[PDB]
Write a protein that binds this ligand. Structure first.
Ligand SMILES: N=C(N)c1cc(-c2ccccc2)c(-c2cncn2CCN)s1
Ligand SMILES: N=C(N)c1cc(-c2ccccc2)c(-c2cncn2CCN)s1
Ligand SMILES: [Cl-]
Ligand SMILES: [Cl-]
Ligand SMILES: [Mg+2]
Ligand SMILES: [Mg+2]
Ligand SMILES: [Mg+2]
Ligand SMILES: [Mg+2]
Lengths: 12, 234, 234, 12
């Protein structure tokens, strides 16, 4: 899936 | 529970060590233990709590998406039995458990003792985030209520942030970023998402002149994430 | 134990799914369950077992090294209390537990039923590897015996591999690679390490002409690791 | 620590 930017560590 | 015999300060120290060692499950357990001491958290401690659980749930989310994609392809061929569904369900249940744990800490009793904007907005944003992660995997008769719980937490956080924080405040910016993603792909409100990201970006831009060099770097980092999303969305 | 009620084939299937999802703790638990069914493992299944535990212990080793480095610096300042040592000890104990689990599977009863060179050498190499990981963290009166257990397992594997496998065989090559690292930094025998890596590389080079395109790629991949080490060592 | 190459996933 295309994941959009969210706050904090991009851990997924 | 299991951290009840360890000093609060030792738990915090070990959370910092666990972060350096990339041991995020340990980091989360240490910070859960620190929360359960009953004292409020400082800004640094709040961020240790959030970073720990964000890393844990992030691994679970990524794994869930891999398994869900395989499962959908299998439905849509050749029938392979119940194993893909079973294992997706296993990871899903673990993910829901982490979200429930975080939400439990926020409800017992971090939010009710949080009076300053920087703590209260931080925790309400977290509440929105972990209901959003529950929403990502929700399919049953509670999905609408999970989505509304995320919306409600984000909206309370937004209302406080607009009254009590400048538009460049990094907590306020990260909240708006995450609420805009909530709108885009959980609430199926892409226009609301775009509006929120644009307005947030523009109002922050106009307030950058008030900031020090260091605060400028903090704020523009998150502004770039809003722009990244707007570029994908428009 | 906890996988006793799941079909062997379902455990294998879920190990493959866990690998795709980068869920290596799950992958290891599934493969432990498969081993405990009591049947021998195929080549693919052996590799699933090894990849799973290598990923688990690799995270623990990396974390242990971070914490050990912080601990040494603290000795080497300002005294910070027992926490660094305690947490290094925690990770160390977890690491030792994983090594003991793998060694237990090999001893009950993978090695004793392994008669073909490709299975027996694979398992004896694993035995050397997990005693080597124990040696990396060993400091007490058992360190010499742990090191000798690693040496003994590697040496039996080497003796079989030289009699029963061609010099390009990837299992044989990976064994020699790992035994050379054992020599270099566990046995404090850098000259033995260099000799073994050089001889292994040269004898493999001279046998490449016998291989298909695909086998050539498999063998030269591991040969490059020998060269990488020789470049650092000479 | 400088880690040398060993077989399989470079997971540490
Ligand atoms: N251990 C971590 N991951 C973090 C610690 C802190 C922090 C916060 C306050 C005081 C000291 C450290 C973070 C933080 C969050 N907002 C700004 N900061 C500082 C750095 N930009 S993040
Ligand atoms: N699931 C994994 N990580 C692996 C699976 C297998 C494998 C082995 C035999 C048959 C089918 C697959 C591996 C393997 C190890 N030696 C060669 N191979 C094949 C690929 N080079 S590795
Ligand atoms: Cl399962
Ligand atoms: Cl500890
Ligand atoms: Mg479910
Ligand atoms: Mg339009
Ligand atoms: Mg110890
Ligand atoms: Mg010399």
């Amino acid at each position: 899936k295309l994941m959009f930017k969210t706050e904090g560590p991009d851990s997924d | 529970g299991a951290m009840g015999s360890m000093e609060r300060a030792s738990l915090i120290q070990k959370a910092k060590l666990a972060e350096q060692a990339e041991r995020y499950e340990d980091m989360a357990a240490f910070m859960k233990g620190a929360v359960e001491k009953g004292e409020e958290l400082s800004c640094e401690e709040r961020n240790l709590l959030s970073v720990a659980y964000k890393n844990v749930v992030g691994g679970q989310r990524a794994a869930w998406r891999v398994l869900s994609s395989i499962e959908q392809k299998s439905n849509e061929s050749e029938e392979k039995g119940p194993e893909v569904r079973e294992y997706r369900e296993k990871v899903e249940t673990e993910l829901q458990g982490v979200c429930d744990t975080v939400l439990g800490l926020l409800d017992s009793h971090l939010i009710k003792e949080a009076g300053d904007a920087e703590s209260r907005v931080f925790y309400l944003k977290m509440k929105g985030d972990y209901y959003r992660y529950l929403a990502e995997v929700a399919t049953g008769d509670d999905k609408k209520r999970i989505i509304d719980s995320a919306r409600s937490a984000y909206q309370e956080a937004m209302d406080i942030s607009k009254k009590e924080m400048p538009p460049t405040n990094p907590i306020r910016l990260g909240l708006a970023l995450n609420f805009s993603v909530f709108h885009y792909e959980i609430a199926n409100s892409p226009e609301e998402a775009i509006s929120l990201a644009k307005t947030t970006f523009d109002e922050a831009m106009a307030d950058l002149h008030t900031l020090s060099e260091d605060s400028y770097k903090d704020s523009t980092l998150i502004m770039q994430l809003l722009r990244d999303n707007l570029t994908l969305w428009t």
